[PDB]
Design a protein around this ligand. Structure first.
Ligand code: MG
Ligand code: MG
Length: 337
DNA sequence: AAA
């Protein structure tokens, strides 16, 4: 296993500014780490008792100031992620999917969700928020049968925290948001709508709290998609093909459909060839977006050496040496007040 | 949970 290379994009700055790093990582929850989907990885290496060590080691060694995780299993949050990262100087916020859904005690422990951790020496938690996409869809369906049938029926969520950035690093506020969108490629419309919902709800948090945004997400969307275009260009045509020409009027409950932020992906221009890496599918579907008005990217952690993967005949993850089917993103950012 |  060779070290992943750091890529410098700009060096540190004279003007007073704070730099900090952000990790975005889908850990692959145990529930979904099955032989069926991951036949090519041996059982002992899929198993959570084994994989959780590689996943902790990954998060520890990245050592980011802000960590956004997806597929964090409820019980693992409280008994593993939080108490171990507390020992490293972090506090955290977590919310599970499916909160409103009836299920046994046992099943409730295994439901996964999104978590944001932050170094308490650098940041103070001002507010925490959960955005349940099923609920925002319900509230915004009026008319539109697609909303209710296609969107409200997906249990996805994002979380967001409002953080106070300690003055000494330079009340400076920062919002960090983390989401995990629906997966199914036949549902490009749900992915885009969940993103519009997440962004507009994030804007609302912002009002009630101009203020820098860091947006981490497993978007399940390629760089060419309607969702990436929407996030990167401040908006998208209400007739974009990703709507499956299937919405209109209800779309602009979150509003050519537009958002106010000015965002760039930390890894734009293909700095990694894929963030999800399996036998059947490899592509960039995970992202760290930041407000380009307040922040520059100083650098990113580059991809694992493609030559190393080929030499070891690794055509999909997880693998004995790679504990998730996603690779972590890690970026260093510089914030100007 | 690019079931
Ligand atoms: Mg997954
Ligand atoms: Mg995914």
């Amino acid at each position: 296993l060779p070290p992943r290379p750091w890529i410098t994009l700009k060096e540190r700055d004279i003007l007073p500014s704070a730099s900090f790093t952000v990790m975005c990582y889908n850990v692959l929850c145990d529930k979904y780490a099955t032989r069926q989907l991951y036949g090519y990885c041996p059982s002992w290496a899929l198993n959570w008792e084994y994989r959780k060590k590689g996943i902790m080691e990954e998060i520890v060694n990245c050592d980011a100031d802000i960590i956004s995780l997806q597929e964090v299993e409820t019980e693992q949050y409280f008994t593993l992620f939080l108490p171990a990262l507390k020992e490293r100087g972090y506090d955290g916020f977590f919310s599970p999917k499916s909160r409103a859904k009836i299920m046994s005690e046992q099943e409730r422990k295994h439901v996964d969700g999104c978590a944001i951790f932050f170094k308490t020496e650098k940041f103070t938690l001002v507010q925490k928020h959960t955005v349940e996409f099923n609920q925002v869809a319900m509230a915004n369906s009026d008319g539109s049968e697609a909303m209710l049938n296609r969107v409200m029926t997906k249990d996805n969520i994002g979380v967001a925290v409002v953080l106070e950035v300690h003055k000494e690093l330079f009340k400076q506020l920062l919002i960090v948001a983390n989401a995990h969108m629906h997966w199914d490629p036949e549902y490009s419309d749900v992915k885009l709508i969940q993103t519009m919902m997440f962004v507009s709800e994030v804007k609302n948090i912002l009002e009630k709290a101009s203020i820098p945004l860091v947006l981490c997400a497993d978007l399940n969307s390629l760089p060419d998609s309607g969702v990436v275009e929407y996030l990167s260009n401040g908006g998208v045509a209400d007739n974009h093909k990703d709507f499956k020409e299937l919405y209109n009027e209800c779309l602009m409950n979150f509003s050519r459909i537009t958002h106010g932020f000015q965002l760039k992906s930390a890894y734009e221009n293909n700095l990694m060839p894929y963030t999800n890496y399996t036998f059947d599918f490899k592509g960039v579907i995970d992202y760290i977006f930041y407000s380009k008005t307040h922040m520059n990217v100083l650098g990113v952690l580059g991809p694992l050496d493609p030559q190393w993967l080929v030499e070891n005949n690794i055509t999909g993850c997880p693998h004995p040496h790679i504990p998730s089917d996603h690779f972590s993103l890690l970026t260093q950012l510089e914030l100007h007040p």
